[PDB]
Every structure is written in structure tokens, then in C-alpha cells.
RNA sequence: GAUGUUAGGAGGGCAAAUCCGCCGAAUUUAAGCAUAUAAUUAAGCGGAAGAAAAGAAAAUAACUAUGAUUCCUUUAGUAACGGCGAGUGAACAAGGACCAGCUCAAACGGUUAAUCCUUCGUUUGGUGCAAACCUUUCGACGGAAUUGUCGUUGAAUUAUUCCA
RNA sequence: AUUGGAAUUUUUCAUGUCGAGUCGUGUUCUUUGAGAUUGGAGCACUAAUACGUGUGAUACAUUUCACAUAAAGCUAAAUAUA
RNA sequence: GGCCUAUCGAUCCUUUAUAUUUGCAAAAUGACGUAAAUUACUUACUACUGUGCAUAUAGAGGUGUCUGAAAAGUUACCACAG
């Protein structure tokens, strides 16, 4: 590290890259976030707009795991098949892939993107978006609610 | 809320009775002591005051008694319970 | 004065480490590189021994 | 400038240099753990220091599909599987009094696991063959030919802990055997909306039962 | 049988009989020296439940302590400091007056004797009067006994100053368990030290 | 890969050159092959392109 | 309850890194300062050990639930606290290291306490050169104690098997 | 070769027990993450018996349901070691 | 809104308006409402549901040293940084 640092660039130059007029002082604005509102307000406004004051209720003891949900969009569901499985379904319209999204850790199925139309697929999941259910039904697939 | 005890869970993930599929697999002696202790000890001054209020036997006296008990005893369930116990004792005493 | 910690544990990935071993073994294969490294090697029959 | 961050998140003002500890003992601790485990493993006649903690379900909706080692023995359930409390204590197996699992599928699976462990284990005669197996009060007193042969034979097969479940290599169904009439999104919302009313009815049910 | 009756009688604490017994005991206690041996325990029921045994190495001692807050130890009243922190009156010490009573016997008379436990007995406005259960580990019976014998261990001299009386578990908050316990369970010091600590280590 | 195929759609000549890395797609069937020169190939992308009957071409080969 | 140079014994003191108890500030920070901060820290007086402390549920959850403690990885700079300014700030799950249980008291046992202890004794073993240690049941004579010692964990009653 | 004990197992019969100036409440001060008070301590008032009462992080009443068994005690190990 | 150029105030805080929108954390408080059913711990179906607290939005209460510290004197006894 020490080979390449700023001291090696400035070593004989007296004011050290920190200004002959200025003369580098211990804490020339005071500590940390102190100048907010008071004299660094312009910095806070232009770079940190939401910062000051309160919003909303207090939950007091939230717990993350109650609301924990990983989501997946329908577009990427056929991608959860390996290559040979995807070829096999593409060939054969007699059978649908069943997809248990839980093994892949997902719990809500969302509606984004296109599908290769006229091919059934069974989606098993806890939760589905309104659009996702409609598109899965539209393409001839099935939605299965399961805990 | 309200997890089932009698109708099996239906595989529905909304947190009702439901959830994932499953089948659940599920005097005399103290009373004699109490009577003896009361014969030895009688009643506390607040108990006596409550007895007088309950004996008066009005909506006003009974409200007063409950407030007095709640103020002294603190715990509301306990105060109601003590008032109930004393009321029963006054009923028993009359016989 | 020196504090005890001066970054004793650095990472460098599993994939990076593996790559270095494979590439170094490959390099060891190469006849020119063996001579270039300063090993005397003229009378060896050929470098992959 | 300073548009990188609003704050320093550092907070070391409670005299950190007094409080501080520097840690780089890792591998040396692991070697000590290995040495300790080697000494124990060898000392007990080669008899396994591992002990079965049976299979239990992981808490809340995040991990409810997941299953792990618990403290899964309970004597009444174990005795129902076939084995005495005293035998379980003698091999040092992983009892707990207050765990008491509440479901039939969990119990039925775990009694099978217990039965497998019970049959699998075989015990040297304590005083060098002055007593018998009996009726099961502690199972499976060995003979000398078998115990010597078994001790020489370390396990070939896989570990005795956690286990894998359903395939990623997905199952299939015929396209004419599916429904197209269900609405899950409507069902979830309607269920949640009607929930309060059902809870009120259930409250009255509880009172009616209790009277 | 007898102890159960004594328990229920003693629980009430009001009544002519209880009030008489309290007044008579309070009178006798007011006369007596600070720390003294008693022949038999003042409340036998309370003694049994707090682990007194009639065994020779078990001795009971009665203790006098003054009541109320202790007042800050500062010369000529008020002293220098921030308005937030003056605290001359209403300072209300962390350790219990019960522990203080155990401590007085623990420092003055214990040695040979070791503090086992202690109970309330009775009080007026100026004083609380406590009875302390003590045990000698030097005496043969306790060393012989396969029960109790842990009190013989070297770590148990001066339990009241070790925080290892019943009162000590109480004021250290170890009776509290669960989420309410917070930064206290391995030791209040230990937990605070872990949080105050930053580990320098291989990775994050 | 989706963007590469989407771009190449009007080209019956198959030789794509990419001065960057070609990444795979897990969001569609991705059947139609190409002949692609790129700076770097993801292993999954390369395997798919080769399987489909395409060509994964070096810059020296180009 | 006193008194005893009564007989047998103990405590006291030193040292302190880690450990535990009390008691307990300010510089400092906010570019000032009074709340907050520094900090439940420094100093002060005490107590321990080779580690201690904590520990066997008046626990967490709301699941298909988990199930003494410690510790690591983590949650998490998050819920949250705060002249809501400066700043401050947890817990549960999960992956592991590692895992060990329990007993008093009360309840129950009155054929006369099945208990306990001091003093005096006494012998079946074993080492060591010797010092010495180490096993070993049997009697006295004293006391303690039913203001409660010991046993026991509902109670019998059957068959089995084990253990001393 | 005596004595003794335990564990199960039948069959009867027993439904007993469960730590109080403590919990709790009011109040104060302290303390904390605790917020219409988190723990501590001082003070005042002071409980209930297992169908109790302690919990379920917003004051409350009326009621669930789940989970626990306070106010007595001990205990190796991983851990710490200027 | 005032013929035009002049006639005034952030966040936190307080207070009242507003909603077929919300929360108070395992549950419930309109209401057994409406239907059926009743050998009951019955089953459906309902857009508008306790006190108290918390929000969200909209004003207003104020900062004239007017981009908003809860702030008097004195030192010829003085100290220090410049």
C-alpha cells in the first residue's frame, strides 16, 4: 500500500496539497452530521431530500419473518425447468409441467412479461397476482393455491 | 387467529383455521383449612368495610365498594373476585 | 503505534484461487516458461516430465 | 461534495479502543476441537459419541416446509415406538421433557426413525457376558463373534443426520385433468375479508362449548 | 400438616392475632442488638421453605437494618455537576435493603459461617428486622451430607457480596427471564461488554 | 441473449459480433441459433448456443 | 442468653489480566448550551476461580411450530429510542460450536426416627526403603433432633427383566 | 449364598400437590429499546389458589385461544484470559 | 381577492377539519345481521363495527438577530488562544 499513497506524491511540498492559505485544521466544521439545517442545509436539501422530520405510525416490535415473501414473475417460471424438460414440454402438448415454486423458495407469483402462447402449465404457489392468475388461465394453465 | 381444534386444516395460506395439511394427535382439604384459618383470624378491616357496604346493598353502595376495592387492591379481576367472595360470605352468613 | 489488526484475513475467491492453480500447472507444462523461470533444462528430454 | 453518504454509521465513541478485541485464532481453535474430538472418539472404545436428535419442523411461515434436528425423543412416544426410557438414557439419546410434538404425521415419522436407530444399535455385554438381552428393557446385548466383527467394520454408508425431500426435476400431469375454474386471488381476498365474521362466530362457538 | 397451617395463618398479616404477634415481635426486636444468634427460627414454616434444616451446621441469626433511601455521599450538600445529575435526595440504591442486611452479617460475623438465605420477619418505619439462615462448611455434618454439600465449595464464601443470595438473584434481575430480560442474561456486564465490543476478525 | 436474438431477427446472415460479454436468458424458450463472436461467454449461454446448432466464435477466428 | 487461655476447628491478609458485586463523574459531543452524549464507562470500596457467570422454563411462537445455558455466524445498524437534532439502539427464527441433568421444601411413611454427629475405639485389604497414604465393619460411651432427621415421588396389586 | 432394590407390565384405587409483606397495584427516583414506565430500588396499599395467575412489546373494560408454571436451590461442557 | 410595483414564516410540537382509505401485532367488541338447518362445538351468506391511542391529508397557533438556540451583569484580581 505505502508505495503508492498521496504522501509519496506530495512529500517535499509544504502545505501538503491542503492549501497554503487554508492551513488544514482539526475539525473545521465540527463533527459528523452537525451542520444540517444550521449551515450545511443546502448540501442536505440537494443530495438527501427525505431526511428531516417524522412520518407514519410506530410498530414497536415488527419481526421480519412474519412478512417474509420471495416473489417470482410468470415469465421466468418456464426457466425454472432444465433444458431437456423444457424441450420435452415444447414437443408434447399432452402433459403440462407442474411447478412447485416452494422448492425454489418463492411464495407469490407475479404477472410480468410474455409467454409462448397455447401451452398449459400448472403453477402451485401460496399467492398469485391478479394478472398472473389471468395469464396462466389464458395460456391454458392452472393455478393451485397451496400453503 | 383461531387455529382449528376440530376440523382439519385445508391447505390455505391466509392464517385462518387453515394452514398446511395435518392431523393433530391430541374439593375438601383446603376448604377445611380455610374455615379453620378464618375462625382463628376473622376479617381484615377493608373486608369489614366491604361487608358493611355490601350489607347496605344499593347500586350506589355496590359501585362505591367496587371503586374502594379497586383503589386498594389495584388488580381489577382480583378486586371483583374479593368483592364476590365477601358477598357470598354475607349470603352464607345470613343462613 | 501499531494496533494488532492490519488486515490479516483477506479473501480472494474460490474460483480465483482454483484458476491460479490450473493456470500455473498449465504454465508448468510450457517448455519455454520452464527455461524462462531460470531452471537449467537443456538436457531434459522434454519439459512435461 | 460528500454526496456518497448522508451519514457516517460508525459509532465508536464509547471508547472503542478500550473495549476492542482482535481475533485470528480460527484454524488453531479448529485443531484443538479436532484433537478433543479425536481423544473422545478413541477413548470410548470406538463407540459412537454422536447421538440421534430426531426430525422436527422449523418455526413460522418462512421455514415451515423446512425440517431439522430437534430434541425429538420423548419417553411416552418412544415407549409407544417400543423402547424403554432407561435404554434411551443408557445410550445417551436426545430426550427433552417439554418439547412434546402435537401432530400424528410428525409422531409417525419419528417413531419409525426411533425404531431404525433401536434395531441398528447393538450393545456389548456390560460385565463380559454375565447377563442377557432380556425382553427389551435394554435391547440387543451382543455375542463376542458379532461384536468383534462389527467393531472392525466402520460404517460404509451415508451419515445419520438431516435428509433431503422432493425433486427439482418436476412432476407432470395430463392437460385434460386440470381445472380452469378456480380463482385463487379472489379466494384469498374473500377469505381474508370474511375472516373477522368467522372469528366472531368461532368466539360464540367457544362460549357455547364452555357453558 | 403443622407448617401448612402456619403458612396460611402467616399469609394474612392482618387480624388482631397477626397484629398482636407483629407488635410483640417488633417490641422485642427494637430492644435487641444489631446482629444476634437465635435458638430456633422465628418463623419455622418460612425457614423450611427457604431451606433451613435442623442439622447442626445450620444456624439462624437475627439482623437490624434502618429503612428508606440512603442520601448521596456528598460533602456540604449539593456539589458540582450537570443539572440532570445532582441526585442528593431520591437516589434509591440498586441493591435491596434485604441484601444490605445479609451484607452486614456477611462482612461482620460470617467467616466460618456462610450466608444461605434470609426472610422478612417484620418492620416499622425506622427499621426492618430480618432473619438470616447461615451454614458452616467446616462442621462435619454438612461435609458428610450428600445433600447441601455444594455450600462447602470454595466459590461460595461471601455469597451476599457475590450476588449469589436469593436477594442477589432478585436485584440482578435473574428472576426475570424472556424478552423482558434484555441485555442481562449471561451477566449485565458481559452483555454490555459484547455490545460495546467491536470484533476485529477475518470477514463480514 | 434475449436482446441478441431480438436484434438479429431481420438478419439471415448469422454472424453476430459483440464487443462485450454474452449472458444467458432464463425468461424465454430461446430456441433460434446464431453464430456469435463475443469478448466473453457465460458457460450456460455458450452451452445453449452450441447445443442449438450455433457457433461461439473467438475474436482470433473472427 | 451470659461466662470460660475449657476440647476440636474456622475466618482475618496479600496479589488481580480475564470474572463478579455495590458506589460512581467530568473532560467530551451538539461547531454555543441546559435535555441527550461521553457512560450504567474512569476513579472509589468489596468478593472469587483456573476459568467464573448462567442454567433446566411463571420460554418463544402463532408455524406442518419450536423447547436448559454458553459461544460463534446472524437478524442488524433493523424494530426502536432521541432538543426525532447531534446521536443512540435490542429480540425471535435459521446455520453451527457444544449440549446433561436435576433436589430441596411442602405432599406421603408412626411397627417406639428407618436419622445425624463428636469422643473412645477395633480389623479385612493394598502400595513405598521409610515417611506415609490407601481400602474396611464392628462395637461402645456421649450428645443433636421429632419447633422434624431419614426414606419416598400418588397407592397398592400382577407378571417379566435387569441391577446391587 | 443371602438379602435388597429398580425399571417396565397387568389389574385395581388416588386425584392429592404447586415457595406472601411475595406477586400485584399506586407512587417516586433510577434505568432501558420500552414506547399512556423495560428492569431495578425506596415508599404506601397489598393478593389469588390451579377452572388458579403469569405471559402473548399502546392506556382500557368484556371474553377467547395458545404457551407457561414465579415468589427455594444446585449443575460439566463449548467461552474469556493486557 | 384588492390597478400595478410593498402588506410577511420550515421541520419537530400543539389544535381542529376530512376518509365507500388505515393500524394498535395469536383472537374477538355492528350482529347470531340475513338465510337455511338444529339429536350441534351446525352451515352458509353479508362493501360500509367498542372507549382510548396512533396515523395520512388540510389549515391554523411562531419563530421581526425575520432559511426559525428555552439566555443578564461585571473584572484597574484575572488566565489563555490569537
Tell me the DSSP string of A18-60: S-TTT---S-TT-STTTTTTTTSHHHHHHH-TT-SS--S---S
Angle at the Cα of E92 from the Cα atoms of E91 and E98, rounded to 5 degrees: 155
C9 touches chain E (CB under 8 A): yes
Which chain D residues are within 8 Å of E196, Cβ to Cβ?
Answer: 14, 19
Helix axes E2-12, B29-41, angle to 10 degrees: 50
C-alpha cell at D156: 460404509
Residue E53 CA to residue E42 CA, distance in Å, equals: 14
Residue D149: CA count within 13 A, CB half-sphere: 5
Q: Which residue has the cell 485544521?
A: A25
* CA–C1' nearest nucleotide, residue D199: I28
Contact between residue E62 and residue E32 where contact means Cβ atoms under 8 Å apart: yes
C-alpha cell at A33: 452530521
Q: Is the distance between the Cβ of D189 and the closest atom of strand I smaller than 7 Å?
A: no
Q: In C1-49, where does DSSP find H-type helix?
A: 14-29, 31-36
Contact between residue D76 and residue D85 where contact means Cβ atoms under 8 Å apart: no
Contact between residue E201 and residue D24 where contact means Cβ atoms under 8 Å apart: yes
Residue A109 CA to residue A102 CA, distance in Å, equals: 11
Q: Which residues contact E164 (CB under 8 A, 6 or more apart)?
A: E156
Residue D205 CA to residue B4 CA, distance in Å, equals: 12
Quote the DSSP letter at residue E111. Answer: B
* CA–C1' nearest nucleotide, residue D56: G66
Which of E193, E196, E203 best probes binding to D when mutated, by most D CB atoms within 10 angstroms?
A: E196
The answer to whether F and C touch (≥3 CB pairs < 8 Å) is no
The CA-based dihedral angle spanning residues E120, E121, E124, E127, taken in that order and rounded to the nearest 10 degrees = -60
Task: Say whether C5 and E202 touch across the interface (CB within 8 A).
Answer: no
Instruction: Give whole-number Cα distances, E87 to E71, E95, E96, E97, E171, in Å.
Output: 8, 17, 19, 19, 21
C-alpha cell at F25: 436468458
Q: Which residue has the cell 438381552?
A: D133
Collapsed DSSP state (helix, strand, coil) of residue D177: coil
Q: Is the distance between the Cβ of E193 and the closest atom of strand H smaller than 7 Å?
A: no
Q: In chain D, where does DSSP find H-type helix?
A: 16-19, 26-43, 60-63, 75-81, 85-91, 104-120, 144-152, 184-210
Instruction: Give whole-number Cα distances, A53 to A31, E17, F12, in Å.
Output: 21, 64, 61
Q: C15 pairs with which residues across the strands?
A: none
The burial of A109, by beta-carbon neighbours within 10 Å (0-12 exposed, 13-18 middle, 19 or more buried), is given as: buried
Nucleotides of H under 7 A from a protein CB: 7-9, 15-26, 28-30, 32-35, 38-50, 53-55, 57-58, 60-75, 79-82
Residue B87 CA to residue B55 CA, distance in Å, equals: 8
- In chain E the beta strands, taken as DSSP E runs, fall at 35-38, 58-66, 114-123, 127-135, 199-200
Number of A/F CB contacts below 8 angstroms equals 19
Collapsed DSSP state (helix, strand, coil) of residue E12: helix
Q: Which residue has the cell 533444462?
A: C41
Task: Say whether F28 and A83 touch across the interface (CB within 8 A).
Answer: no
Residue A147 CA to residue E138 CA, distance in Å, equals: 66
Collapsed DSSP state (helix, strand, coil) of residue E8: helix
Number of C/E CB contacts below 8 angstroms equals 7
Instruction: Output b/e per residue, D188-201; b: 16+ Cβ within 10 A.
Output: beebeeebeeeeee
E202 touches chain C (CB under 8 A): yes
Closest CA relative to residue A144, chosen from A112, A121, A113, A117 = A121
Contact between residue A95 and residue A132 where contact means Cβ atoms under 8 Å apart: no
Residue E135 CA to residue B33 CA, distance in Å, equals: 34
* CA–C1' nearest nucleotide, residue A65: G93
Residue A42 CA to residue A33 CA, distance in Å, equals: 13
Instruction: Find the Å distance, CA of residue D200 to C1' of nucleotide I29.
Output: 9
Give the closest-approach CA distance of C5 to chain D in angstroms.
Answer: 6
- φ/ψ of residue F54, rounded to 5: -80, -170
Q: Nucleic chain I: which protein residues 192-211 of D have CB below 7 A from it?
A: 194-197, 199-201, 203-206, 208-209
The CA-based dihedral angle spanning residues E40, E42, E46, E52, taken in that order and rounded to the nearest 10 degrees = -20
Q: Using CB atoms, list chains with 3+ pairs below 8 Å to chain F.
A: A
- φ/ψ of residue C29, rounded to 5: -45, -45
Residue C7 CA to residue D24 CA, distance in Å, equals: 10
Experimental method: cryo-EM
Q: Nucleic chain G: which protein residues 4-63 of D have CB below 7 A from it?
A: 7-9, 11, 13-15, 18, 23, 33, 36-37, 51, 53, 56-63
Q: Say how many C-beta atoms besides its own lie within 10 A of residue C39's C-beta.
A: 10
Q: Using CB atoms, list chains with 3+ pairs below 8 Å to chain B.
A: A, D, E
DSSP H or E run through A124? strand A122-125
C-alpha cell at A40: 450545511
Quote the DSSP letter at residue D83. Answer: -
Amino acid at each position: 500500500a505505502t508505495r503508492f499513497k498521496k504522501n509519496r506524491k506530495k512529500r517535499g511540498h509544504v502545505s501538503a496539497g491542503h492549501g497554503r492559505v487554508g492551513k488544514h485544521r482539526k475539525h473545521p466544521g465540527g463533527r459528523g452530521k452537525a451542520g444540517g439545517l444550521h449551515h450545511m442545509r443546502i448540501n442536505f436539501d440537494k443530495y438527501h431530500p427525505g431526511y428531516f422530520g417524522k412520518v407514519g405510525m410506530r410498530h414497536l416490535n415488527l419481526l421480519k419473518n412474519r412478512t417474509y415473501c420471495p416473489t417470482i414473475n410468470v415469465d421466468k417460471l418456464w426457466g425454472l425447468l432444465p433444458e431437456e424438460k423444457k424441450k420435452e414440454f415444447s414437443e408434447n402438448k399432452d402433459i403440462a409441467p407442474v411447478i412447485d415454486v416452494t422448492r425454489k423458495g418463492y411464495f407469490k407469483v407475479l404477472g410480468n412479461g410474455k409467454l409462448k402462447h397455447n401451452q398449459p402449465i400448472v403453477v402451485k404457489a401460496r399467492y398469485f397476482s391478479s394478472v398472473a392468475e389471468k395469464k396462466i388461465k389464458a395460456v391454458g394453465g392452472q393455478c393451485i393455491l397451496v400453503a | 387467529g383461531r387455529k382449528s381444534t376440530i376440523k382439519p386444516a385445508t391447505g390455505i395460506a391466509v392464517g385462518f383455521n387453515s394452514g398446511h395439511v395435518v392431523t393433530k394427535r391430541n374439593s375438601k382439604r383446603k376448604e377445611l383449612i380455610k374455615d379453620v384459618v378464618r375462625e382463628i383470624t376473622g376479617f381484615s378491616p377493608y373486608e369489614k368495610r366491604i361487608i358493611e357496604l355490601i350489607k347496605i346493598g344499593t347500586s350506589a353502595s355496590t359501585k362505591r365498594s367496587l371503586k374502594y376495592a379497586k383503589k386498594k387492591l389495584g388488580t381489577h379481576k382480583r378486586g371483583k373476585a374479593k368483592r364476590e367472595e365477601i358477598q357470598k360470605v354475607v349470603i352464607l352468613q345470613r343462613r | 503505534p501499531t494496533k494488532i489488526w492490519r488486515r490479516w484475513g483477506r479473501k480472494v475467491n474460490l474460483k480465483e484461487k482454483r484458476y491460479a492453480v490450473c493456470s500455473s500447472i498449465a504454465a508448468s507444462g510450457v517448455t519455454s516458461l520452464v527455461l524462462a523461470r531460470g531452471h537449467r533444462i537443456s538436457h531434459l528430454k522434454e519439459v512435461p516430465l | 461534495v460528500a454526496h456518497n453518504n448522508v451519514l457516517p454509521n460508525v459509532h465508536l465513541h464509547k471508547w472503542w479502543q478500550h473495549r476492542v478485541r482482535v481475533n485470528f485464532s480460527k484454524n488453531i481453535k479448529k485443531k484443538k476441537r479436532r484433537l478433543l474430538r479425536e481423544k473422545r472418539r478413541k477413548a470410548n472404545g470406538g463407540t459412537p459419541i454422536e447421538k440421534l436428535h430426531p426430525i422436527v419442523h422449523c418455526p413460522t411461515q418462512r421455514y415451515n416446509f423446512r425440517t431439522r434436528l430437534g430434541k425429538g425423543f420423548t419417553f411416552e412416544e418412544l415407549k409407544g415406538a417400543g423402547l424403554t426410557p432407561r435404554a434411551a438414557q443408557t445410550i445417551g439419546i436426545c430426550y427433552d421433557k417439554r418439547r412434546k410434538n402435537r401432530s400424528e404425521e410428525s409422531l409417525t415419522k419419528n417413531v419409525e426413525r426411533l425404531l431404525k436407530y433401536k434395531n441398528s444399535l447393538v450393545m456389548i455385554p456390560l460385565k463380559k457376558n454375565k447377563a442377557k438381552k432380556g425382553i427389551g428393557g435394554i435391547p440387543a446385548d451382543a455375542d463376542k463373534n458379532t461384536i468383534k466383527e462389527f467393531r472392525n467394520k466402520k460404517p460404509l454408508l451415508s451419515i445419520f443426520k438431516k435428509e433431503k425431500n422432493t425433486k427439482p426435476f418436476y412432476e407432470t400431469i395430463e392437460v385434460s385433468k386440470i381445472d380452469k375454474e378456480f380463482l385463487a386471488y379472489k379466494t384469498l381476498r374473500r377469505a381474508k375479508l370474511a375472516e373477522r365474521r368467522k372469528n366472531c362466530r368461532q368466539q360464540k362457538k367457544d362460549i357455547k362449548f364452555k357453558s | 400438616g403443622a407448617y401448612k397451617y402456619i403458612q396460611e395463618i402467616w399469609k394474612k398479616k392482618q387480624s388482631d392475632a397477626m397484629h398482636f404477634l407483629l407488635r410483640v415481635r417488633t417490641w422485642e426486636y427494637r430492644q435487641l442488638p444489631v446482629v444476634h444468634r437465635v435458638s430456633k427460627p422465628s418463623r419455622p414454616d418460612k425457614a423450611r421453605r427457604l431451606g433451613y434444616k435442623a442439622i447442626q451446621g445450620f444456624v439462624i441469626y437475627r439482623v437490624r437494618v434502618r429503612r428508606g433511601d440512603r442520601k448521596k455521599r456528598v460533602k456540604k450538600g449539593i456539589v458540582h455537576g450537570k443539572p440532570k445529575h445532582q441526585g442528593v435526595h431520591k437516589q434509591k440504591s440498586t441493591r435491596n435493603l434485604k441484601s444490605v442486611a445479609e451484607g452486614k452479617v456477611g462482612k461482620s460475623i460470617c467467616g466460618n459461617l456462610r450466608v444461605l438465605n434470609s426472610y422478612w420477619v417484620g418492620q416499622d418505619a425506622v427499621y426492618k428486622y430480618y432473619e438470616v439462615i447461615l451454614v458452616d462448611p467446616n462442621h462435619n455434618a454438612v461435609r458428610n451430607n450428600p445433600k447441601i454439600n455444594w455450600i462447602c465449595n470454595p466459590v461460595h464464601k461471601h455469597r451476599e457480596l457475590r450476588g449469589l443470595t436469593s436477594a442477589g438473584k432478585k436485584y440482578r434481575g435473574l428472576r426475570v427471564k424472556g424478552h423482558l430480560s434484555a441485555k442481562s442474561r449471561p451477566s449485565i456486564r458481559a452483555n454490555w461488554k459484547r455490545r460495546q465490543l467491536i470484533k476485529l476478525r477475518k470477514c463480514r | 441473449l434475449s436482446k441478441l436474438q431480438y436484434h438479429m431477427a431481420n438478419h439471415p446472415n448469422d454472424i453476430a459480433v459483440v464487443v462485450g460479454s454474452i449472458t444467458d436468458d432464463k425468461r424465454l424458450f430461446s430456441l433460434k441459433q446464431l453464430k456469435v463472436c463475443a469478448l466473453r461467454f457465460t458457460e450456460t449461454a455458450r452451452k445453449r448456443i452450441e447445443d442449438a446448432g450455433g457457433e461461439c466464435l473467438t475474436f482470433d477466428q473472427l
